[PDB]
């Protein structure tokens with residue numbers, strides 16, 4: 001009946017009110033044409049001011065969408081770039097997550113993974129921990145879908161459920177213990193790029209230092225930082241944060257691992273981002289098959305963020321060359337953390 005579930009797992013105890021719980025749900029594909037009207041409509045806050053139903057201007061990059069009979073030849077494919085307004089995608093404003101801890105309002109938004117004709121939205125809710133004591137369930141409409149959100153009492157008292165076990169990651173590295181009593185586990189993390197200019201937000205200076213990649217003109221590159229939640233329940237992590245062990249494992253994860261096969265690679269493609277650029281500013285790879293990985297990224301070589309939506313293409317997310325690259329808007333992965341299992 002086009003009804004899907006989203007679970008908010010409220011822990012029994014957390015240390016700080018500045019702590020977000022993450023819910024998400026991957027939804028079935030919709031026609032690409034329908035994305036232009038998609039916007040989450042949530043009953044989850046008492047005041048129905050849904051701050052992220054703001055417009056972000058994207059450059060939508062597309063290719064023919066159909067491969068010829070010459071798979072072996074790797075002629076590139078011409079792209080079309082169009083300016084489009086998308087509402088409700090996970091473009092977090094600077095300080096929005098922090099402000100939620102005081103307003104107690106949750107943030108609702110979606111990622112898109114698309115081939116040339118269909119898009120799978122992944123709906124996220126970022127819930128400030130104090131709202132677990134105010135809410136039991138609510139409803140989000142997105143396109144044809146109705147998502148019933150449920151605030152559940154978690155299985156774990158305080159940690160992260162990892163294979164039926166409750167792992168509690170250490171919060172800090174105040175004391176280094178040479179022969180410790182502890183475990184290491186691989187914990188899921190989600191990171192969102194927050195676009196904001198300033199002299200501390202020159203993330204590509206840190207990309208240059210950490211990965212000895214080839215980036216001249218690091219002064220012309222996108223400015224901002226990633227904000228991440230670990231284990232679906234944590235205080236936010238700001239990435240990069242030098243002299244912070246977990247920020248730096250996520251930083252490595254974002255820039256080294258942004259990702260029978262369900263898709264097939266068709267050929268290279270280059271695009272103008274934004275539509276009016278005098279030459280191509282982004283490299284991509286056209287693919288065919290099931291929508292695979294996020295279609296949302298941010299252009300590397302513009303200090304003011306140029307958001308890119310590239311249905312049916314993989315943007316170049318590899319920063320060896322830096323020119324004509326992009327970064328992920330939403331990155332998901334695993335990082336290893338020390339901690340211990342509850343018992």
Ligand SMILES: *[C@@H]1O[C@H](CO)[C@@H](O[C@@H]2O[C@H](CO)[C@@H](O)[C@H](O)[C@H]2NC(C)=O)[C@H](O)[C@H]1NC(C)=O
Pocket residue numbers: 255256257318319320
């Ligand atoms: C980013 O692209 C570079 C360039 O192809 C990749 O670096 C190559 O990696 C292979 C092994 O995977 C080496 O044999 C080459 O010598 C490398 N080329 C260089 C350093 O110029 C790199 O693997 C890509 N990054 C990711 C994460 O896949």
Ligand SMILES: *[C@@H]1O[C@H](CO)[C@@H](O[C@@H]2O[C@H](CO)[C@@H](O)[C@H](O)[C@H]2NC(C)=O)[C@H](O)[C@H]1NC(C)=O
Pocket residue numbers: 029115116117118288289290291
């Ligand atoms: C683009 O992606 C869509 C969505 O995955 C593909 O359409 C689905 O194809 C699967 C498997 O072939 C079918 O089981 C579904 O019925 C299709 N979904 C819909 C909504 O029709 C489609 O094949 C992809 N297009 C190309 C050219 O690969």
